[PDB]
């Protein structure tokens, strides 16, 4: 089901490659075009074996000597794909969070479009690399109820998919219903439980049955009931119940859409899905847009940065 557009390299051989790279860097400038030709062709694992063989072959460090060569967008397009796949995400999460402002768009994406497992692979790796505790760090950056909400993800306790209990899909949306429009005021109590633990088939049919009884969908409704960081969130977590190649490919967009460019969203989003569903985020960009990513990105990207991108991405229609 799921599908990624960057895969394994059958012939391959990192010795090879790592030297490659050496002589692509080696001299006077850089042969930036040798370098995303090889990077964007292999998988996330084969690149830390080159990665290795390069240290081992010239006692050198890759990422190091790019950080060296390489600049602007493409360095940091190439040094994201340089980032081992278990800890990209608690890379960036540890980089929104630092400093004095945060940069809650990030912790919103990550942690809404991240199933519970990952939620917790995404934990382990966090502090075992910066020796700090995720909750504690979104905690401490956080409040009200936006960081109530994301603790409750960072649970990743959500329940089981099992059999759908109507009686039981009936009673959520008239709690939803009359936590929201039927009072002088906001629950968020109510919807930051029934949104956050209840499961993936159950609250689908929840979103139905709650357009039924009350003529809104519950992304109106949260726009009407909530505001600021809530607000995004929730929208976020609904979105992602719904489909989160669909969410993605929606937050992709609105980063180029704009005038200017969110490389940072734009770089995020293909690197991390890359090998996990960017093909499916793909079709969903299409459907929804009109537009392929592919031709989207052709014209708000340039340079090396632009063809690594559209190597990454891939499919011309889509
Ligand atoms: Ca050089
Ligand atoms: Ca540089
Ligand atoms: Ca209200
Ligand atoms: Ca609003
Ligand atoms: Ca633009």
Request: proline share 1%; hydrophobic share 40%; with cysteine.
């Amino acid at each position: 089901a799921l599908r990624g557009t960057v895969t394994d390299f059958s012939g391959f051989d990192g010795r090879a490659d790592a030297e490659v790279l050496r002589k692509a860097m080696k001299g006077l400038g850089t042969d930036e075009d040798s370098i995303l030709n090889l990077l964007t062709a292999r998988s996330n694992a084969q690149r830390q074996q080159i990665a290795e063989e390069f240290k081992t072959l010239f006692g050198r460090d890759l990422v190091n000597d790019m950080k060296s060569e390489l600049s602007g967008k493409f360095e940091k397009l190439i040094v994201a794909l340089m980032k081992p796949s278990r800890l990209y995400d608690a890379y960036e999460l540890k980089h929104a969070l630092k400093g004095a402002g945060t940069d809650e768009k990030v912790l919103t994406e990550i942690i809404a479009s991240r199933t519970p497992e990952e939620l917790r692979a995404i934990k382990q790796a966090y502090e075992e690399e910066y020796g700090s505790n995720l909750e504690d760090d979104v905690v401490g950056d956080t409040s009200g109820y936006y960081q109530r909400m994301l603790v409750v993800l960072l649970q990743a306790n959500r329940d089981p998919d099992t059999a759908i209990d109507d009686a039981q899909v009936e009673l959520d949306a008239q709690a939803l219903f009359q936590a929201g429009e039927l009072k002088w005021g906001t629950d968020e109590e109510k919807f930051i439980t029934i949104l956050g633990t209840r499961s993936v088939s159950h609250l689908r049919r929840v979103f139905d049955k709650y357009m039924t009884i009350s003529g809104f969908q519950i992304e109106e409704t949260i726009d009407r009931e909530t505001s600021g960081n809530l607000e995004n969130l929730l929208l976020a977590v609904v979105k992602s119940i719904r489909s989160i190649p669909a969410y993605l490919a929606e937050t992709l967009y609105y980063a180029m859409k704009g005038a200017g460019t969110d490389d940072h969203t734009l770089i995020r989003v293909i690197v991390s899905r890359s090998e996990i569903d960017l093909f499916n985020i793909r079709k969903e960009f299409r459907k929804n847009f009109a537009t392929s990513l592919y031709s989207m990105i052709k014209g708000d990207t340039s340079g090396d940065y632009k063809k690594a991108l559209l190597l990454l991405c891939g499919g011309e229609d889509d």
